[PDB]
Design a protein around this ligand. Structure first.
Ligand SMILES: [Mg+2]
Ligand SMILES: [Mg+2]
Ligand SMILES: [Mg+2]
Ligand SMILES: [Mg+2]
Ligand SMILES: [Mg+2]
Ligand SMILES: [Mg+2]
Ligand SMILES: [Mg+2]
Ligand SMILES: [Mg+2]
Ligand SMILES: [Mg+2]
Ligand SMILES: [Mg+2]
Ligand SMILES: [Mg+2]
Ligand SMILES: [Mg+2]
Ligand SMILES: [Mg+2]
Ligand SMILES: [Mg+2]
Ligand SMILES: [Mg+2]
Ligand SMILES: [Mg+2]
Ligand SMILES: [Mg+2]
Ligand SMILES: [Mg+2]
Ligand SMILES: [Mg+2]
Ligand SMILES: [Mg+2]
Ligand SMILES: [Mg+2]
Ligand SMILES: [Mg+2]
Ligand SMILES: [Mg+2]
Ligand SMILES: [Mg+2]
Ligand SMILES: [Mg+2]
Ligand SMILES: [Mg+2]
Ligand SMILES: [Mg+2]
Ligand SMILES: [Mg+2]
Ligand SMILES: [Mg+2]
Ligand SMILES: [Mg+2]
Lengths: 188, 155, 122, 260
RNA sequence: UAUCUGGUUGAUCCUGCCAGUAGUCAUAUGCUUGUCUCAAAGAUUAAGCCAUGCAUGUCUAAGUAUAAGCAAUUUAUACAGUGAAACUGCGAAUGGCUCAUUAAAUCAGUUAUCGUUUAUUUGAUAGUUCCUUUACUACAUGGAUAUCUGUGGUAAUUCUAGAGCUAAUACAUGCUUAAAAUCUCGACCCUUUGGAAGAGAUGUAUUUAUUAGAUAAAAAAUCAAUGUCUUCGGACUCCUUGAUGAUUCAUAAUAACUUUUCGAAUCGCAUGGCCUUGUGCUGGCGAUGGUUCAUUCAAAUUUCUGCCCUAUCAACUUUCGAUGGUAGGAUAGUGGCCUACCAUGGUUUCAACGGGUAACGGGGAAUAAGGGUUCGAUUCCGGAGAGGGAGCCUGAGAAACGGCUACCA
RNA sequence: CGGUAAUUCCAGCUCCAGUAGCGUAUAUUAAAGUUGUUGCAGUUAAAAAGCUCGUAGUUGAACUUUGGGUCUGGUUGUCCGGUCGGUUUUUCAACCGGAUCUUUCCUUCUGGCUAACCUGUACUCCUUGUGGGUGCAGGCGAACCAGGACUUUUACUUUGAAAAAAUUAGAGUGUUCAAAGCAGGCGAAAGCUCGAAUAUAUUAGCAUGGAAUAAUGGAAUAGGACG
RNA sequence: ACCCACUCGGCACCUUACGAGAAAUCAAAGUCUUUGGGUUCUGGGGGGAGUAUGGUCGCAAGGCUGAAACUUAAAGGAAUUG
RNA sequence: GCCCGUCGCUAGUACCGAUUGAAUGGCUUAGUGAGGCCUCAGGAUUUGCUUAGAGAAGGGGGCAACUCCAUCUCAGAGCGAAGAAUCUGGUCAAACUUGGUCAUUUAGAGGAACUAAAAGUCGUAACAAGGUUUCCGUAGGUGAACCUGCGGAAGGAUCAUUA
């Protein structure tokens, strides 16, 4: 149906290319998934070469990830917080690649309580040396700390949730993190 | 031609899968990844010293030069980051046994490493399909100046 | 769709129809060597002309270089075996002058008559 | 149309079958396998047109079902298996083993090989790459992939293959002054030495290859298959031995040799 | 195998045309027709319409058998000989026909896919499923559904509704399983040279990150972190790395997820080897399946260059994607393929755009000195189409039409 | 052509041409140098714009590396067959190269291999000898790589690689001849055995030589070239 | 201001043409079947027709641009004798 | 001699042409929108595992929570898995409806041509200085050729008048 033909597109100059052949399967491109965050659902699809290519549908949760530490968790999503293609996907709350989003952050705390155990927002004798050997490694970039206290970090998902099925993404850190915050204050 | 702003879209563009570590404290900050292109083409330092990201550059991108390494002069430069190379040639016509001077303009992407102007000759490598028409990528502005530094008559 | 079995309209008519002296000269040939048709003559003339056509397209090139030398020799070899060309002449430029009369006198038609057997040709 | 093609029409039949213009609309499509469509040789052509052990396709089919036929150790019951270049075809009834090797003309030849040497198959590269479990592996243009190769088995370099087991006996490097068999169209099935290797960035590696007679010629690397170092090629080659004579030279040898 | 004649004149020589002349795997027809080989043959006009019949189905030692089938006789006290029927598998996307579209499209050569899918093909291959470790399905988990048994309808049809049983390589779940090494956790002692009893996690696919994937050469001073051997002046030495022209490649790591894929509750022939004398533990030749990597058959794009006539088509494209960009969305994947926001490009007298084509492209064909002209529906190779135009199921592969849905005719 | 001897109409006999074919129609190619690039015409036969300007086009003067030597490879005619109708040199030849030297670089180096002796370290296996080589510190690099550095770019032409097969030309061959076809051929006739070529296709791309031809380019604010 | 000789520029004649040309003639209309210096334009039997149409230009007249169907064996040109 | 036109008859070619002409196809506004695919739900039905009480005659190897067995098996009910019609948006978009528009066809009353002509009228324009020399351009006029201005050209009826 929704084909990807170079057949259509008039032409490089203008010459309205005549409809050579009825459009083919191998040219096709299916309906856009635009997956929400409202009760976890996935349908697969039989693509080229068989291939189960899972289409995410109202996907809740995805494993959003640190940089400094290098970790990700069974992390709940909250909402579509800013999408730099089209703002249409912000209000409808449709999740998409490179969309800025908010992360429940409780799993990012619970695991951080082990990793270092210094706590973010504001027992046993030999562990105290592993606790002491670790920690004071990463100080974290302020916005992430306040967002840790908010229970709502700023990720920027990088899976393709109509292709993949998985809604797995990436916690914003540093410059890009500093940038998308300015756009969030511009939009709000 | 445009140009300059680096990060100025609705999105903010990084070199994908490439990182500028906040924990680490180098002088550059930004790990400028770059590509050695091959086919005896030198990487111009304006790419590696510079700022702009560009998906569609050969040096600062995933674009891989291959196949036909065309050439020709540059006629049109007006659009954003692409160029139109005018690849003149002859066409033999046996029933006469002479030649047509024929034309074909070739649209070709610019990595802003190079400074391209109108009336400049330019080698240019085929690569991925960049766009609709642009299947080509500027690799070497041969007339870098072409009497640019020197006009200039009065002794 | 096995393949088109090729053929030739091998034997081809002259480019006028009524050159009086040719009409006689062809009769003379069909009378001497006993030929039911003009066809039998043109057959030889063409069959011959094909050879001539080679000889010309070899003599255009230098005999000393390859095809000229090889295809020409093989062309001569072929003629001497078929027995049209003499053993005096094996020089390619002599092939050019072969003529229809020499071809006909080599047929089984005639080589009956030339070895006796029949008497009176036809 | 609508996916891959199942027939192969006889005029389209690659010429080095020497398939007959008439006596069939179709040709046997060489099935999928280790060798490319036109570079292969399906067994029907091999057993019928070449060797004449079968008088028709039926008899070939049965010949494969009873089953003394063994292309590269394994048996095959496939009438049109791609028995390509180097493929050791052993018929245990008759003991008539054949390696598949090109006659100087280009068309493949029956080489009635020993017990004995028909036991390894020489094979090229292709890759060098690595797979999962970090295993380095080598691939042969002539079909197989072989695991765990010697690190300095490089690309466009041959490899002797144990064939029955399928491992590595030995390898010949590719470089200057090394006997090289040829598998490219016009220079196909010639043999020579190697002088140059024009590197060429993108546009195909060339190789300048003088024969025994020292008539130079050029090919591409992909159409070249290193049979050894000069003097000792690792395979027994047919009468002619990759020379490729001139046209008059062949005419000379034929009409000289008349022994009734 | 380069060839010319008749015709305007009272006659002449030209311009010039007409007429002849020869040939066409170029059509038609008109006569005539004994044989041999060979042999096109509803393209031209209507890609107009179609009765009838046929042209695609397929089982092996080897997926499913109490046909209330056939066998029948010297393996069945769960089965074993043949096998209709049916599900599963695979095939029906091949071939065949045709030429309507279609004029940078197709198509030819040329590249490319570092830009992708690929059942089949023949090569490769998964101790990690366990989740605290003093009594647990694993020598085998479940109920269905078909063919059948009948109960039927109908004016029709390769229409099938209910119940009863009955399977699977069908559909679901689901066990074992080490040793080591590496990463997260940890009863204290003794004032340093600090150092460890022991607990959890680690396949494959998946997802994003993040790091490695190096390589132009020799020799230092010492400032912060401060390690090994101390023969207590101090030494520090042997310190890793594939491929391409070229990578964010191959590949390997740290982090996890996931409506947690895959890791055989499968099948036919063969009946061997040790006795801890159980019917114990063991083992051959095959089949299919199954993972990504390969290869093959291919597949989509795509590079370059190349078309018939028309200026009685000079501008065209850009509201309704035109040209470029950034981001997404989709796709197997690249991309104005689609969407948002932005810029104003793009082609053109080196004929853009438009129109025409009694145009499918090419191979080729006829003609035949050389140069050419015209033809190519048509035996091969591409491409299209199956009354039109759409839309899609299954499937590795279909925008299938000897599949289906629809609307028009 | 046909108005009472019509050689053209219509019939018999002759006769011609072709002949199991030949006619007719339409296309079409040739003939048509009546489409013309090769290759046409234009004072009057058709045809020079009334004139000039003029952008695209197309076209565009001459000039830069010529000549001489010195060897050294071939390739056919010669001089006899030196020979068992074929072959190997010399007396000779033209022709095509190659190396160089001529005020002359052929792209240059960072290194690998320095093959070689320009050598001379012990000087002699040895006819009275500069016939001949076991032999290694300085070191001729073209005998090859394997990496830089950066190429004035084209057209042009070369041989090459590729331009599916059938077709096309064409080699081999007794389909009986052919048109064709890829067959075939020879034994004890107990087994053996040649084949199934070669060429073209020149448009574009790729390869390498050549440097005339033609264009293009470089130092005149030298911001030039070298070290 | 002439004469006379030769010269750059202009406008035309005479004779032979050995050169062209169908010839008339032409020193260009030569250096063309011994076919190639460069370029632009026009013509392809006669008519139908400079018409029909469509542009386009004009106040209009008209121009520029420009058909075929149909038709026909000649239309011409140059010269020869009448 | 040749001959040129107006006007007549007899056929056919094209031309224009009111027709609010007609058709076919190509594009095309607005409205509708078939049918699938995805999507929001929807749940006819089919079942597993829960120890959920039986009658069961050893319902696990001899009165007894059977020396209680995937026990006899339905009221459970909870928890699933699969799952039809139906259905909320999308999307692709046939086709229709009612227009609009290009191209090709094709009736068309009428007009106005042009060509063949058996051969008729009216003149006799041109060709001879064709009896006003022809022509061309261009205006006007006529019954037709034609004529007449103006300018031009000789293809002129002149390569010629010297002082
Ligand atoms: Mg087909
Ligand atoms: Mg490549
Ligand atoms: Mg001719
Ligand atoms: Mg006349
Ligand atoms: Mg007369
Ligand atoms: Mg004619
Ligand atoms: Mg069974
Ligand atoms: Mg890295
Ligand atoms: Mg990678
Ligand atoms: Mg796969
Ligand atoms: Mg994108
Ligand atoms: Mg058509
Ligand atoms: Mg055509
Ligand atoms: Mg065709
Ligand atoms: Mg047709
Ligand atoms: Mg076809
Ligand atoms: Mg039909
Ligand atoms: Mg369809
Ligand atoms: Mg079909
Ligand atoms: Mg059908
Ligand atoms: Mg012609
Ligand atoms: Mg003419
Ligand atoms: Mg005139
Ligand atoms: Mg010049
Ligand atoms: Mg032939
Ligand atoms: Mg005319
Ligand atoms: Mg709908
Ligand atoms: Mg007078
Ligand atoms: Mg008069
Ligand atoms: Mg008068």
């Amino acid at each position: 149906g929704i084909s990807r033909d170079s057949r259509h597109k008039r032409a490089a100059t203008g010459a309205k290319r005549a409809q050579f052949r009825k459009k083919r399967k191998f040219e096709l491109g299916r309906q856009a998934a635009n997956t929400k965050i409202g009760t976890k659902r996935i349908h697969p699809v039989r693509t080229r070469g068989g291939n189960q290519k899972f289409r995410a549908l109202r996907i809740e949760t995805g494993n959003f990830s640190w940089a400094s530490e290098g970790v990700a968790r069974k992390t709940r999503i909250t909402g579509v917080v800013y999408h730099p293609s089209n703002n249409e996907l912000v209000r409808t709350n449709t999740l998409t690649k490179a969309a800025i989003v908010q992360i429940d952050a409780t799993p990012f705390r619970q695991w951080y309580e082990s990793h270092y155990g210094q706590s973010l927002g504001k027992t046993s004798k030999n562990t105290e040396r592993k606790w002491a050997a670790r920690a004071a490694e990463a100080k974290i970039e302020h916005a992430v700390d306040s967002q840790f206290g908010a229970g709502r970090l700023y990720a920027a998902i990088s899976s393709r949730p109509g292709q993949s099925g998985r809604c797995d993404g990436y916690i914003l850190e540093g410059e890009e993190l500093a940038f998308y915050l300015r756009r969030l204050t511009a939009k709000k | 031609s445009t140009e300059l702003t680096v990060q100025s879209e609705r999105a903010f563009q990084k070199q994908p899968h490439i990182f500028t570590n906040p924990k680490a404290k180098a002088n550059r900050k930004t790990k400028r990844w770059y590509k050695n292109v091959g086919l005896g083409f030198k990487t111009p330092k304006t790419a590696i010293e510079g700022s702009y990201i560009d998906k569609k550059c050969p040096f600062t991108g995933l674009v891989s030069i291959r196949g036909k390494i065309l050439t020709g002069t540059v006629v049109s430069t007006r659009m954003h980051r692409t160029i139109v190379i005018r690849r003149d040639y002859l066409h033999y016509v046996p029933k006469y046994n002479r030649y047509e001077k024929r034309h074909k303009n070739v649209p070709a992407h610019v990595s802003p490493a190079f400074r391209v102007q109108v009336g400049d000759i330019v080698t240019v490598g085929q690569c991925r399909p960049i766009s609709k028409t642009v299947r080509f990528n500027v690799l070497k502005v041969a007339s870098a100046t072409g009497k640019a530094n020197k006009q200039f008559a009065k002794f | 769709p096995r393949a088109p079995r090729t053929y030739s309209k091998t034997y081809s008519t002259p480019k006028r129809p009524y050159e009086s002296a040719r009409l006689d000269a062809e009769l003379k040939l069909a009378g001497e060597y006993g030929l039911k048709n003009k066809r039998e003559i043109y057959r030889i003339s063409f069959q011959l002309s094909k050879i001539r056509r080679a000889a010309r397209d070899l003599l255009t090139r230098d005999e000393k270089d390859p095809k000229r030398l090889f295809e020409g020799n093989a062309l001569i070899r072929r003629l001497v075996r078929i027995g049209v060309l003499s053993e005096d002449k094996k020089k390619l430029d002599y092939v050019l002058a072969l003529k229809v009369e020499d071809f006909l006198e080599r047929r089984l038609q005639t080589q009956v008559y030339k070895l006796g057997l029949a008497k009176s040709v036809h | 149309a609508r996916g891959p093609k199942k027939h192969l029409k006889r005029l389209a039949a690659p010429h080095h079958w020497m398939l007959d213009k008439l006596s069939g609309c179709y040709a046997p499509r060489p099935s999928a396998g280790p060798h490319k469509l036109r570079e292969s040789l399906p067994l029907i052509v091999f057993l019928r047109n070449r060797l004449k052990y079968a008088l028709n396709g039926r008899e070939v089919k049965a010949i494969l079902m009873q089953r003394h036929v063994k292309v590269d150790g394994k048996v095959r019951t496939d009438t049109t298996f791609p028995a390509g270049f180097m493929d050791v075809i052993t018929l245990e009834a008759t003991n008539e083993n054949f390696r598949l090797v090109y006659d100087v003309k280009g068309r493949f030849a029956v080489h009635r090989i020993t017990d004995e040497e028909a036991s390894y198959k020489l094979a090229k590269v292709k890759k060098v790459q690595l797979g999962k479990k970090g295993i380095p592996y080598v691939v042969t243009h002539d079909g197989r992939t072989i695991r765990y190769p010697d690190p300095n088995i490089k690309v466009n370099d041959t490899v002797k293959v144990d064939l029955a087991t399928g491992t590595i006996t030995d390898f010949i490097k590719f470089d200057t002054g090394k006997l090289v068999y040829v598998t490219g169209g016009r220079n196909l099935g010639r043999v020579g030495t190697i002088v140059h290797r024009e590197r060429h960035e993108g546009g195909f590696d060339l190789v300048h290859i003088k024969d025994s007679l020292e008539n130079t010629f050029v090919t591409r690397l992909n159409n070249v298959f290193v049979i050894g170092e000069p003097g000792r090629p690792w395979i027994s080659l047919p009468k002619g031995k990759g020379i490729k004579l001139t046209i008059s030279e062949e005419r000379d040898r034929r009409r000289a040799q008349h022994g009734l």
